[PDB]
Design an enzyme around this catalytic site. Structure first.
Site, PDB file in Angstrom:
ATOM      1  N   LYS A 112     -11.804 -20.870  18.784  1.00 23.22           N
ATOM      2  CA  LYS A 112     -11.234 -21.243  17.494  1.00 23.22           C
ATOM      3  C   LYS A 112     -12.056 -20.659  16.347  1.00 23.22           C
ATOM      4  O   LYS A 112     -11.498 -20.209  15.339  1.00 23.22           O
ATOM      5  CB  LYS A 112     -11.151 -22.768  17.385  1.00 23.22           C
ATOM      6  CG  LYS A 112     -10.106 -23.439  18.318  1.00 23.22           C
ATOM      7  CD  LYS A 112      -8.673 -23.415  17.735  1.00 23.22           C
ATOM      8  CE  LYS A 112      -7.659 -24.012  18.746  1.00 23.22           C
ATOM      9  NZ  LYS A 112      -6.254 -24.083  18.229  1.00 23.22           N
ATOM     10  N   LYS A 194      -3.937 -17.429  27.765  1.00 25.92           N
ATOM     11  CA  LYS A 194      -3.258 -18.723  27.741  1.00 25.92           C
ATOM     12  C   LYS A 194      -2.120 -18.691  26.731  1.00 25.92           C
ATOM     13  O   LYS A 194      -2.243 -18.094  25.662  1.00 25.92           O
ATOM     14  CB  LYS A 194      -4.234 -19.861  27.351  1.00 25.92           C
ATOM     15  CG  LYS A 194      -3.561 -21.236  27.386  1.00 25.92           C
ATOM     16  CD  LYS A 194      -4.440 -22.493  27.138  1.00 25.92           C
ATOM     17  CE  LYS A 194      -4.880 -22.745  25.719  1.00 25.92           C
ATOM     18  NZ  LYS A 194      -3.670 -23.141  24.900  1.00 25.92           N
ATOM     19  N   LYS A 197       0.108 -22.537  21.266  1.00 25.25           N
ATOM     20  CA  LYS A 197       1.152 -23.121  20.439  1.00 25.25           C
ATOM     21  C   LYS A 197       1.074 -22.636  18.996  1.00 25.25           C
ATOM     22  O   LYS A 197       1.887 -23.053  18.165  1.00 25.25           O
ATOM     23  CB  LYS A 197       1.122 -24.659  20.520  1.00 25.25           C
ATOM     24  CG  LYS A 197      -0.169 -25.327  20.075  1.00 25.25           C
ATOM     25  CD  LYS A 197      -0.033 -26.844  20.137  1.00 25.25           C
ATOM     26  CE  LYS A 197      -1.345 -27.532  19.740  1.00 25.25           C
ATOM     27  NZ  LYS A 197      -1.588 -27.368  18.263  1.00 25.25           N
TER      28      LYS A 197
HETATM   29  N1  LIG Z   1      -0.817 -22.775  28.031  1.00 25.95           N
HETATM   30  C1  LIG Z   1      -1.044 -24.026  28.449  1.00 25.95           C
HETATM   31  N2  LIG Z   1      -0.744 -24.342  29.727  1.00 25.95           N
HETATM   32  C2  LIG Z   1      -0.918 -25.603  30.135  1.00 25.95           C
HETATM   33  N3  LIG Z   1      -1.371 -26.651  29.441  1.00 25.95           N
HETATM   34  C3  LIG Z   1      -1.663 -26.306  28.182  1.00 25.95           C
HETATM   35  C4  LIG Z   1      -1.539 -25.050  27.617  1.00 25.95           C
HETATM   36  N4  LIG Z   1      -1.948 -25.063  26.293  1.00 25.95           N
HETATM   37  C5  LIG Z   1      -2.301 -26.309  26.090  1.00 25.95           C
HETATM   38  N5  LIG Z   1      -2.154 -27.115  27.188  1.00 25.95           N
HETATM   39  C6  LIG Z   1      -2.382 -28.549  27.269  1.00 25.95           C
HETATM   40  O1  LIG Z   1      -1.482 -29.182  26.383  1.00 25.95           O
HETATM   41  C7  LIG Z   1      -2.061 -30.430  25.935  1.00 25.95           C
HETATM   42  C8  LIG Z   1      -1.937 -30.525  24.432  1.00 25.95           C
HETATM   43  O2  LIG Z   1      -2.667 -29.433  23.836  1.00 25.95           O
HETATM   44  P1  LIG Z   1      -3.216 -29.586  22.342  1.00 25.95           P
HETATM   45  O3  LIG Z   1      -3.823 -28.293  21.945  1.00 25.95           O
HETATM   46  O4  LIG Z   1      -2.165 -30.210  21.504  1.00 25.95           O
HETATM   47  O5  LIG Z   1      -4.342 -30.751  22.411  1.00 25.95           O
HETATM   48  C9  LIG Z   1      -5.549 -30.589  22.981  1.00 25.95           C
HETATM   49  O6  LIG Z   1      -5.919 -29.506  23.330  1.00 25.95           O
HETATM   50  C10 LIG Z   1      -6.354 -31.864  23.165  1.00 25.95           C
HETATM   51  N6  LIG Z   1      -7.766 -31.602  22.766  1.00 25.95           N
HETATM   52  C11 LIG Z   1      -5.764 -33.014  22.350  1.00 25.95           C
HETATM   53  C12 LIG Z   1      -6.509 -34.302  22.536  1.00 25.95           C
HETATM   54  C13 LIG Z   1      -7.230 -34.974  21.593  1.00 25.95           C
HETATM   55  N7  LIG Z   1      -7.815 -36.084  22.143  1.00 25.95           N
HETATM   56  C14 LIG Z   1      -7.479 -36.150  23.473  1.00 25.95           C
HETATM   57  C15 LIG Z   1      -7.830 -37.078  24.448  1.00 25.95           C
HETATM   58  C16 LIG Z   1      -7.345 -36.894  25.735  1.00 25.95           C
HETATM   59  C17 LIG Z   1      -6.531 -35.810  26.039  1.00 25.95           C
HETATM   60  C18 LIG Z   1      -6.185 -34.886  25.060  1.00 25.95           C
HETATM   61  C19 LIG Z   1      -6.657 -35.045  23.760  1.00 25.95           C
HETATM   62  C20 LIG Z   1      -3.494 -30.463  26.483  1.00 25.95           C
HETATM   63  O7  LIG Z   1      -3.563 -31.273  27.650  1.00 25.95           O
HETATM   64  C21 LIG Z   1      -3.768 -28.998  26.835  1.00 25.95           C
HETATM   65  O8  LIG Z   1      -4.645 -28.861  27.945  1.00 25.95           O
END
Ligand SMILES: Nc1ncnc2c1ncn2[C@@H]1O[C@H](COP(=O)(O)OC(=O)[C@@H](N)Cc2c[nH]c3ccccc23)[C@@H](O)[C@H]1O
Ligand SMILES: CC(=O)NCc1cccc(Oc2ccc(-n3c(=O)n(C4CCNCC4)c4ncnc(N)c43)cc2)c1
Ligand SMILES: O=c1[nH]c2cc(Cl)ccc2o1
Lengths: 333, 323
Positions: A112, A194, A197
């Site tokens: 990031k 990867k 989003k």
């Molecule tokens: N290309 C991909 N293939 C498969 N899985 C993927 C891909 N891109 C993203 N992910 C998963 O999607 C979830 C949400 O991603 P975020 O970036 O919103 O959000 C995140 O990356 C977290 N830090 C948000 C968060 C904040 N606090 C937490 C506590 C527990 C679990 C999660 C969170 C995530 O599970 C992420 O692993």
């Protein structure tokens, strides 16, 4: 009482089929088996600079996507992170049990920071501590995430163990729940990357809210390989694009990779892409139909947010009180 | 508008006569000039590993001593930081508008609270639309960061925060008894350099007796920081207690030895401390009075803090909580 599931997703960017398969699909499947708590982590989202109107809309978009995916507010707790102060409160306290080196070594912070060199902010650095607070507040046993969050989850375990070793059984040590398919869906034009989003190149992504016809076109243009003859076989190192397509198909249909390989025997990438496009297009069509029914119902979204914050607050306040008692704060009256 | 003053009172470390006569005594007499806020900053404390029961006790010790020195919970707002969630909430939000570089410019084994507390301090101040902060001399860079953050946020979102200013004017010089060139500091490891507000007359006599003086022959009680720093400090301490001028004390001690001066210093210091100590032990052992003070103070603080936080959250674009 059932074991507790917690996970979150950021109301930034546009959630993709990667977010779905790596996370939301598991979230939906775990709702009866476990006591599930799902969070829209708006406080995490602002570690990347957001437009204020986009952030508010995206928070409501994300909530409606949870519901559209099948997250059921009568089964799971659904809430917006900033609605529960205990997340920030525990986050600060856990800062003092987290070491600078544990944070500077995070892959997410590094990636990031390289993307947003103009906004390497302390929130982005401190991201894993708030995330550990999110999990540990709820006595969480299972955290369904994609592979990219594994390092963050490992730190939350280290923090929970460190704190517990000093103060007693204040936290549960959480365990990752990472799926066998779709834990790391890759970009359609750069299958070593990867799927993001927030990709600048939308042709890399399958957005959950994107026009299905637009998605089908992106699928047909997804890169494959030069194999002669073309062969549908899983091999991430040599056939990253075909493998990623197989992974998406397996995740939407439930069919195993060996089964898909057998289904495509004698066939080439046109058959592969045709049925990735069919499966995804149908999933997105049905998902989006439910989505608009939820998204345009402010009363229902408002009620879900209210009930969810109330349920979350009851859990979180209990944990924070035990944390504050353990570290030696005078308890609030 | 009557200016808002924010002070962060760190629980650990007993206040010294330098803390009292040099600053708090004067702030006690400005409680009607300014809307003063005294935050007992237990969340700042935990950047340093420490015994939990001692931190709880020191929080209550600090509260009773501030009350004993004359902070009036009816005129000023006094409360424990952790009782007001808005501090941590605004702290996280302000992390997202603070450059990592700003914190590094203030290794792998320091905890993140030690790295990140300047942001918490900015939140502590900015929550209350604070106009004035009586920072320590070691906290000036921290206040500059808080001003930078406030202006940065304001430039993006409108005039959400007041830009705070240091409280510039100083009220009495109290130096270390055994190192007269060093300010008497409540965090000093050498306890013989300091006189704490809770010290008994026998302790005061002993510490004043060892206070360094000079080898002037004859001994001469005269003010001269360059050449007679120890005697000058004793004179400053005595004047700060009694209100007598340095020239008057010089006349009063003509022909006198340092033992006489030290005797008067101890007596005057202990006389000052006895009404303070009576009030302290009486407040400190009234658990319900202390509980009411914290309840009322946190309620006052949270009413103000929640106004600011909601404006911050609205500006960032968070969906408003549903009550
Ligand atoms: N290309 C991909 N293939 C498969 N899985 C993927 C891909 N891109 C993203 N992910 C998963 O999607 C979830 C949400 O991603 P975020 O970036 O919103 O959000 C995140 O990356 C977290 N830090 C948000 C968060 C904040 N606090 C937490 C506590 C527990 C679990 C999660 C969170 C995530 O599970 C992420 O692993
Ligand atoms: C004296 C006064 O009123 N100052 C204004 C003010 C405003 C808001 C909070 C506030 O509370 C705190 C409490 C502690 C700190 N703080 C703090 O000032 N230092 C110092 C210690 C030595 N000089 C340089 C840095 C801290 N070192 C570790 N952890 C901390 N939390 C540190 C910093 C701030 C103080
Ligand atoms: O995880 C975190 N880090 C934080 C830093 C501040 Cl200043 C406040 C709350 C936090 O929660």
């Amino acid at each position: 009482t059932k074991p507790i599931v917690f996970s979150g997703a950021q109301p930034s960017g546009e959630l993709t089929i990667g977010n779905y398969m790596g996370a939301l699909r598991q979230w939906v499947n775990m709702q009866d088996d476990y006591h599930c708590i799902y969070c829209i982590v708006d406080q995490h989202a602002i570690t990347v600079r957001q437009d204020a109107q986009k952030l508010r809309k995206a928070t409501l978009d994300t909530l409606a996507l949870y519901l559209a995916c099948g997250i059921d507010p009568e089964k799971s707790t659904i809430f917006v992170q900033s609605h529960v102060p205990e997340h920030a409160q525990l986050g600060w306290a856990l800062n003092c049990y987290t070491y600078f080196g544990e944070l500077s070594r995070m892959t997410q912070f590094k990636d990031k920071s390289a993307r947003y060199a103009e906004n390497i902010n302390a929130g982005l650095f401190d991201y894993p501590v708030l995330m550990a607070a999110d999990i540990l507040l709820y006595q969480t046993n299972l955290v369904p995430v994609g592979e990219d969050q594994k390092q963050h989850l490992e730190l939350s375990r280290d923090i929970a163990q460190r704190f517990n070793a000093l103060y007693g059984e204040i936290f549960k040590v959480p365990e990752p729940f990472i799926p066998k398919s779709g834990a790391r869906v890759m970009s359609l034009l750069e299958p070593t990357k990867k799927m993001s989003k927030s990709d600048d190149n939308r042709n890399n992504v399958i957005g959950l809210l994107e026009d299905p016809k637009s998605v089908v076109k992106k699928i047909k243009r997804a890169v494959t390989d030069s194999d002669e003859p073309p062969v549908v076989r899983y091999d991430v190192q040599n056939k990253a694009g075909v493998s990623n397509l197989l992974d998406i198909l397996s995740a939407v249909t439930g069919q195993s990779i060996p089964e898909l390989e057998k289904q495509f025997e004698g066939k080439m990438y046109g058959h592969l892409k045709g049925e990735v496009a069919d499966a995804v297009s149908g999933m997105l069509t049905e998902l989006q139909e439910r989505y608009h029914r939820f998204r345009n119902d402010e009363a229902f979204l408002q009620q879900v947010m209210k009930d969810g914050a109330e349920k979350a607050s009851a859990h979180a306040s209990r944990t924070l009180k035990a944390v504050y008692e353990a570290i030696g704060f005078v308890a609030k009256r």
